[PDB]
Design an enzyme around this catalytic site. Structure first.
Site, mmCIF file in Angstrom:
data_model
loop_
_atom_site.group_PDB
_atom_site.id
_atom_site.type_symbol
_atom_site.label_atom_id
_atom_site.label_comp_id
_atom_site.label_asym_id
_atom_site.label_seq_id
_atom_site.Cartn_x
_atom_site.Cartn_y
_atom_site.Cartn_z
ATOM 1 N N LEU A 1 2.640 -5.096 -4.145
ATOM 2 C CA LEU A 1 2.167 -3.736 -4.348
ATOM 3 C C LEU A 1 2.972 -2.763 -3.492
ATOM 4 O O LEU A 1 3.545 -3.130 -2.463
ATOM 5 C CB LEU A 1 0.677 -3.644 -4.020
ATOM 6 C CG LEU A 1 0.291 -3.500 -2.548
ATOM 7 C CD1 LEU A 1 -1.205 -3.262 -2.393
ATOM 8 C CD2 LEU A 1 0.732 -4.693 -1.744
ATOM 9 N N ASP A 2 3.003 -1.505 -3.924
ATOM 10 C CA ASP A 2 3.859 -0.509 -3.294
ATOM 11 C C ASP A 2 3.392 -0.198 -1.875
ATOM 12 O O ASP A 2 2.219 -0.361 -1.532
ATOM 13 C CB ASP A 2 3.883 0.769 -4.132
ATOM 14 C CG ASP A 2 4.914 1.764 -3.646
ATOM 15 O OD1 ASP A 2 4.631 2.479 -2.661
ATOM 16 O OD2 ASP A 2 6.009 1.827 -4.242
#
Ligand SMILES: CCCCCCCCCCCCCCCCCC(=O)O[C@@H](COC(=O)CCCCCCCCCCCCCCC)COP(=O)(O)OC[C@H](O)CO
Ligand SMILES: CCCCCCCCCCC[C@H](O)CC(=O)SCCNC(=O)CCNC(=O)[C@H](O)C(C)(C)COP(=O)(O)O
Ligand SMILES: CCCCCCCCCCCCCC(=O)O
Lengths: 122, 61, 81, 128, 459, 127, 86, 172, 12, 71
Positions: free
Chosen positions: G40-41
């Protein structure tokens, strides 16, 4: 009331200033206006420990109110008919006041419109 | 602030020769205003010491 | 006990304002990442919250009935006198 | 939009809109780099006495002792008479004293002249 | 007296020849016993002052101070006996000798009938105190502090000696009785002006008055605790006793000349309490607090009205018992932490529960709630000052507002807060400390029931 | 990045030490060892009296605590105040003064035995 | 109320992560480092701890928040802060 | 130390989102405005010029500073929160227990005996922590505020006593 | 689950 | 340790409600209205303004004693 707008925004001359009214003699123009009386004599009025602001002419409509309130204790829901009588009697001396307030109001333009009336033709 | 608004009202009564009516306002204000505080206290303690009016809702039922 | 946490597959955006939020976000080209998080805040027993005024007349359903029997006693006492 | 947040001596400018962190050169990073180091030396030292079982005393802070000295004794020997200090001594000193003297004396003269003629009446005031 | 002075003097050979370790015991025994005997003088007749001999007499002003001094004597013994237990027997015996001698002068001074006899012993109190502050002090500035205290008191007292003997040659006897019954109008004249200034400055310096007060923050802070009380709790009032007696002859010149002193005290008391609002030493905090209270006594004397004299003695006694208490409080911390900085030892209610309670009533008495004797004194002066001038209530009350901030300030900074992490030597308070604190506050709250005893010679 | 491997081990040993230290903060069932004190006779009389717990014991228990409460917090305090306010202060004039009983025309006064003259007729100001 | 215990925290921990649609339910190891596998970012973990911040009613300071990157870490920090000692 | 840009922008995201919490109130409104806030952050993510990133920050920080709620929602167990240090007034330090009277000391024999074990353990390991520090001090004094762990076995982590034996956050 | 209560010694 | 929890915690679910709180709330939320309408019926005049306010304009000069403009 609505007279406040006509006193400040409107010309204050036509409207009374409750601070000093009445100004002209109230008996003037009044054919035998009836003199106020109160049944409650002073010593019993002072006996009832009745507050100064509540010592008006209709103050005798308290003495029975307190009497029933005193005797009917503990029943507080009672003493309603005579209490309503005092409030109704508070109605009567109160409506008396806007009668003389209006009378002062009506005699105001009366005198004033007269002032330029009997002076403009000359 | 609601309380301080109330006591502001009471002195308004005192201004125009209404002292005893203020004392009537004293008693009537005393009853329900005290109630509102621990009603708030009950919900605050129940919601793990949360007092912010945002993290509330759905408490009527 | 254990305090068993509720199941996972019964809290989605259906029947909630969140799905309306989801379609607005999809209209502008976005994906809601936390859509199913609130879920319980709208679904379950926490749904169908009464209106402001509706809560104000809480108990009026029986308060009016209390009036009817009370005013009936007054009428009966009035007729008795 | 909304014009900026001008600061004040009482409402300081926040660090979230300060140009210092929004325009940085390598030199600034070098100076602020070992700010932790000088604090770490103070922290590591302070922790060493604090966590010392044999330490059964109070740990003196030389900065704190210096502050008490700076506020108590290192003032007059470092005091230098200048017109700024001299004027401030008179303005904050003898000034208000004469100000209250004039105010009170005038009131006493006002009061004394008034009851001499018979203006104020204390028919019920007895205790004084 | 002879019935209090002689037992006081006889304590001197008793302590010197007492047992090796029983010195603190026996001295505490009879000093309390002598205080009990001095309770007998709390009674005063209708108007004539209680007269025993030609050289000694008492009135409704000296006796409330006499009991305060003799009651104080046990208190310095227990408070000081903590650190004094670590030196030679002769050194400890010399201290108890010196407190006994210092108290002896105070008892004889307050009941002196001849003004010259009053002045001799009034200044004689310097020698026992001066050696206390210097020899047994626990700092370095004490050396300069002792000089400041001695020279300030002496520089004002010496004009009094010249002025006093001048009254002897001109008027005649200087007995406090014959002076009163033969009061003559001190007319306004430049020679009389300096006559007024000389007879007043000596007592003003020992108040101290705003400006002639810098000896107090040096003397009181550096002094040992057995001293730190008396320089604040009794002998400041000794200057007070001088004023209320010497002003019998200084009329009517006092009202014309009082203006510089009133403005200095009435305006300076705001400034002095402002120092307490921002201070670093707990002892200095109470020290400047004493200046503000004494400054209120300074203005109180000079109106010379029945209410002012009552509130003068009421505050004068109450502050002494109060300011003595706070010095005990600062002593306890100063022993545990070995520093006087306020912020160093923040948090004591967490560790010492009752110490906070004693600190609470101690800071409350200085706060002067009704009906505490502090309040019953300050309130009387406010009414007397207000009758003198209506504007002074702005200044008088401003201190009352200001004194609330600092009086509760060390309560917040020291007690009400997170305990300091690094400090680890705080011990459960010894039963001596708590017993001493009760010996301070219990008479004060008990005195609230009957203020007539301490209300002064005009009740 | 991210816990550093050194700080990972640092928090790990601190974690288990914290768990063990807090485990040591526990309280064994025997604790606290409390030496007893002399018991007033009424207490032991209650314990053998409340062996049932039925309303037989409940009503008397609650009312006895309330009854003794009334005696030592309502009865005896107002007793000494009544003595204080009947013989001590009352022997001193102008210490207990009330507004005169506000009477009305009508009902007689108990002492003079004379009916106060009632007012005259009101002008039938009926609603 | 009974104290928030370690097994209670972790069960509430992956309660939130699986409730996150960005993470597949199956790949939810208790030590699944957020950057490594879930990927995930770097903005996302900053927004997930807020849900955890609201979940347990606390605050995770940015100084510690940026390092907190494992489900085991999240339960570790919460347990250590609120004196959880089984 | 030096707070790099990618951390500072994350601080903005965390704090700004908490601020619109005090603004959005309702959860559905939150989730909508958060997504717009989130994606409007991601739309500008290819700025090879780091100067332009600060230029984008040149208006965001003022955007936060005037759009911030004057009464932002902070959890009570935190600075500004209503329950900040509320239960601190019971955090009595553990070393104070050494001053307990023996009668109270004997009141809890098991805990006091274990306290002795910890005290003995602390005494033994203190010097072990001490030489561990100067065995790996950075040349020129401690560079970072961080603290090295226990490298070898049978060694407690350096400077562990106050951290491990700190009072519980809910002492009562 | 009851545990110790570290408090100052009030016996004296 | 020991029990004594009539309620139990709920996780993201409506909390358990008992009988006593529900009808206790209903009773007082209903009797507050019972007081509202009952006192309204008996004393509507208090809020209505039982005593009317006469219109000043309709009061003619006769009973007002205002002698006319001819003088
Ligand atoms: C450290 C500085 C001083 C501090 C403050 C001290 C108090 C201020 C006043 C200073 C003068 C105190 C000395 C007073 C002596 C007795 C005063 C007295 O009783 O009044 C006499 C007046 O006193 C004086 O005349 C002397 C005092 C006035 C000031 C002059 C001397 C003192 C100032 C210088 C020495 C002190 C200053 C320090 C110097 C280093 C009355 O006598 P007479 O003048 O009426 O005599 C009869 C006839 O008329 C002619 O004699
Ligand atoms: C709805 C109401 C809101 C009210 C409140 C509104 C608050 C302000 C809104 C406006 C914010 C503004 O557009 C952006 C700004 O603050 S600054 C520039 C961002 N540009 C970069 O940061 C490029 C460099 N890149 C990195 O730092 C990393 O890549 C990153 C950490 C971003 C991702 O990590 P990885 O993944 O790469
Ligand atoms: C429908 C309008 C109702 C009245 C609204 C305004 C009330 C305040 C102003 C009038 C106050 C009483 C009259 C004056 O005098």
């Amino acid at each position: 009331g609505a007279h406040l707008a006509r006193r400040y925004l409107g010309d204050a001359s036509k409207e009374p200033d409750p601070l000093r009214m009445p100004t002209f003699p109230p008996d003037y123009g009044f054919p035998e206006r009836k003199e106020r009386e109160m049944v409650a004599t002073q010593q019993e009025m002072n006996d009832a420990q009745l507050m100064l602001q509540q010592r008006d002419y209709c103050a005798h409509y308290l003495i029975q109110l307190l009497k029933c309130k005193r005797d009917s204790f503990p029943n507080f829901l009672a003493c309603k008919h005579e209490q309503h009588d005092w409030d109704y009697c508070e109605h009567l001396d109160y409506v008396k006041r806007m009668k003389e307030f209006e009378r002062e109001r009506r005699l105001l333009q009366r005198k004033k419109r007269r002032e330029q009336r009997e002076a403009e033709m000359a | 602030f609601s309380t301080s608004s109330q006591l502001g009202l009471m002195m308004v009564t005192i201004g125009i020769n209404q002292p005893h009516l203020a004392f009537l306002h004293i008693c009537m204000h005393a009853f329900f205003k005290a109630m509102l505080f621990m009603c708030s206290g009950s919900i605050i303690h129940s919601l793990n010491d949360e007092q912010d009016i945002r993290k509330m809702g759905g408490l009527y039922k | 006990s254990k305090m068993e946490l509720p199941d996972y597959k019964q809290w989605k955006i259906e029947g909630t304002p969140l799905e309306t939020v989801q379609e607005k976000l999809a209209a502008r080209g976005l994906r809601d990442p936390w859509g199913r998080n609130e879920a319980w805040r709208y679904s379950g027993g926490f749904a169908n919250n009464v209106s402001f005024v509706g809560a104000l007349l809480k108990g009026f359903k029986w308060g009016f009935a209390a009036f009817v029997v009370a005013v009936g006693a007054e009428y009966y006492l009035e007729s008795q006198n | 939009s909304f014009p900026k947040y001008k600061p004040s001596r009482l409402a300081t400018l926040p660090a979230t809109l300060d140009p210092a962190e929004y325009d940085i050169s390598p030199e600034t990073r070098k100076a602020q780099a070992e700010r932790l180091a000088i604090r770490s030396r103070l922290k590591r030292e302070y922790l060493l006495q604090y966590n010392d079982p044999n330490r059964l005393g109070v740990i003196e802070d030389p900065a704190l002792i210096r502050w008490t000295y700076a506020r108590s004794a290192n003032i007059y020997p470092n005091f230098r008479p200048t017109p700024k200090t001299s004027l401030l001594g008179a303005l904050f000193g003898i000034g208000p004293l004469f100000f209250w003297y004039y105010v009170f004396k005038t009131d006493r003269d006002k009061k004394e002249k008034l009851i001499q003629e018979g203006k104020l009446d204390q028919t019920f005031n007895i205790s004084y | 007296m002879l019935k209090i002075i002689i037992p006081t003097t006889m304590l001197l050979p008793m302590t010197w020849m007492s047992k090796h370790n029983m010195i603190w015991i026996n001295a505490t025994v009879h000093s309390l016993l002598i205080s009990l005997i001095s309770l007998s003088l709390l009674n005063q007749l209708g108007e004539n002052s209680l007269n025993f001999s030609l050289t000694f007499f008492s009135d409704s002003l000296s006796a409330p101070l006499l009991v305060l001094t003799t009651w104080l004597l046990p208190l310095m013994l227990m408070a000081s006996q903590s650190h004094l237990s670590k030196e030679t027997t002769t050194r400890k015996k010399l201290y108890i000798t010196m407190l006994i001698l210092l108290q002896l002068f105070l008892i004889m001074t307050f009941t002196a009938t001849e003004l010259i006899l009053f002045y001799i012993l009034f200044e004689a109190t310097l020698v026992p105190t001066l050696i206390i502050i210097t020899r047994w002090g626990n700092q370095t500035e004490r050396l300069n502090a002792g000089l400041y205290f001695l020279f300030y008191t002496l520089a004002g007292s010496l004009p009094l000696l010249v002025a006093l003997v001048y009254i002897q040659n001109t008027t005649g006897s200087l007995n406090f009785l014959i002076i009163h019954y033969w009061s003559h109008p001190l007319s306004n004249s430049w020679s009389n002006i300096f006559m007024w200034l000389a007879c007043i400055m000596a007592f003003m310096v020992k108040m101290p008055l705003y400006g002639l007060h810098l000896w107090l923050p040096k003397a009181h802070v550096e002094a040992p605790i057995a001293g730190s009380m008396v320089l604040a709790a009794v002998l400041l009032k000794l200057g007070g006793y001088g004023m209320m007696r010497i002003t019998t002859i200084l009329n009517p010149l006092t009202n014309y000349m009082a203006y510089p002193f009133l403005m200095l005290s009435m305006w300076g008391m705001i400034m002095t309490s402002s120092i307490c609002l921002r201070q670093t030493d707990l002892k200095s905090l109470i020290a400047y607090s004493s200046v503000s209270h004494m400054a209120l006594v300074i203005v109180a004397i000079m109106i010379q009205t029945p209410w002012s004299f009552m509130g003068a003695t009421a505050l004068m006694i109450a502050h002494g018992l109060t300011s003595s208490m706070l010095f005990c409080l600062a002593n306890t911390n100063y022993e545990r932490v070995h520093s006087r900085t306020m912020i160093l030892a923040r948090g004591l209610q967490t560790l010492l529960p009752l110490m906070a309670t004693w600190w609470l009533m101690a800071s409350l008495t200085n706060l002067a709630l009704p009906p505490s004797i502090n309040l019953i004194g300050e309130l009387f002066i406010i009414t007397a000052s207000f009758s003198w001038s209506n504007i002074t209530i702005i200044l008088m009350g401003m201190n009352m507002m200001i004194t609330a901030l600092y009086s509760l300030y060390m309560l917040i900074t020291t007690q009400r807060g997170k305990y300091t992490h690094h400090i680890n030597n705080i011990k459960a308070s010894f039963t001596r400390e708590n017993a001493l604190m009760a010996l301070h506050i219990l008479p004060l709250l008990l005195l609230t029931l009957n203020p007539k005893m301490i209300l002064g010679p005009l009740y | 990045s991210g816990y550093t491997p050194d700080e990972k081990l640092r928090l790990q040993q601190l974690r288990e030490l914290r768990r063990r230290w807090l485990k040591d903060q526990e309280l064994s069932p025997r604790e606290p060892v409390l030496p007893p004190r002399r018991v007033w006779p009424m207490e032991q009389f209650w314990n053998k009296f409340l062996q049932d717990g039925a309303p037989w014991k409940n009503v008397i228990y609650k009312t006895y605590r309330h009854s003794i409460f009334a005696v030592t917090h309502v009865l005896i305090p107002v007793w000494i105040i009544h003595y204080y306010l009947k013989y001590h202060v009352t022997a001193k004039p102008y210490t207990v003064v009330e507004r005169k009983p506000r009477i009305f025309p009508g009902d007689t006064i108990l002492e003079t035995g004379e009916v106060i003259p009632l007012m005259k007729e009101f002008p039938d100001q009926h609603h | 109320a009974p104290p928030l215990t370690l097994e209670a925290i972790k069960d509430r921990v992956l309660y939130v992560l699986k409730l996150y649609d960005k993470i597949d339910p199956e790949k939810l190891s208790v030590n699944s480092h957020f950057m490594k596998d879930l990927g995930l970012d770097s903005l996302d973990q900053v927004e997930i701890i807020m849900a955890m911040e609201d979940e347990f009613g606390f605050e995770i300071p940015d100084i510690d928040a940026e390092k907190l990157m494992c489900p085991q870490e999240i339960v570790d920090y919460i347990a250590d802060k609120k004196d959880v000692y089984e | 130390a030096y707070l790099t840009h990618q951390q500072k922008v994350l601080r903005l995201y965390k704090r700004a989102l908490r601020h619109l919490e005090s603004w959005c109130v309702h959860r559905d409104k939150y989730r909508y405005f958060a997504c717009l806030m989130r994606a409007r952050f991601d739309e500008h993510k290819n700025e090879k010029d780091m100067v332009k990133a600060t230029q984008l920050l040149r208006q965001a920080e003022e955007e936060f500073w005037y759009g911030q709620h004057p009464q932002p929602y902070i959890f009570p167990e935190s600075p500004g929160g209503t329950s900040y240090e509320r239960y601190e007034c019971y955090k009595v330090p553990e070393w104070c227990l050494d001053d307990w009277h023996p009668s109270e000391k004997a009141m809890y024999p098991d805990y006091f005996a274990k306290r002795e074990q910890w005290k003995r353990l602390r005494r033994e390991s203190w010097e072990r922590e001490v030489k561990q520090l100067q065995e790996e001090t950075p040349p020129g004094g401690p560079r970072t505020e961080a603290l090295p762990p226990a490298r070898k076995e049978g060694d407690l982590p350096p400077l562990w006593w106050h951290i491990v034996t700190r009072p519980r956050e809910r002492p009562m | 689950k009851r545990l110790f209560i570290i408090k100052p010694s009030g016996f004296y | 340790a020991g029990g004594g929890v009539h309620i139990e915690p709920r996780y993201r679910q409506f909390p358990q409600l008992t009988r006593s709180q529900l009808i206790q709330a209903e009773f007082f939320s209903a009797t507050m209205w019972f007081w509202i309408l009952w006192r309204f019926w008996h004393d509507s005049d208090a809020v209505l303004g039982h005593f009317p306010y006469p219109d000043p304009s309709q009061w003619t000069d006769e009973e007002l004693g205002i002698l006319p403009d001819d003088e």
